[PDB]
Symmetry: C3
Subunit: 36 residues, 3 copies
């Protein structure tokens, strides 16, 4: 159970980071938009 759960958590965290990267990029463009 634990080995699989951990592998799943590692996969989920990587996909979670991907999401954050995208948002950080969204935030960057929005700020570029606003002029800063």
């Amino acid at each position: 159970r634990l080995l699989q759960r951990i592998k799943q958590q590692e996969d989920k965290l990587e996909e979670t980071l991907s999401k954050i990267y995208h948002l950080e990029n969204e935030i960057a463009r929005v700020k570029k938009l606003l002029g800063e």
Copy 2:
């Protein structure tokens, strides 16, 4: 507890994803506003 630590991490991750979901909505709204 390797067992409790993992359930802890799982719960944490779920809440983190809930936070991200909300932020996705916020930035999308801000983006629509800016045009």
Copy 3:
């Protein structure tokens, strides 16, 4: 493995949460700097 992998995941998630925090702050500044 397992113990060294849960620790690494816990650190990773803490770093991620920090990113989320800064994100929330950035979106709170960008937005309602127009409202």
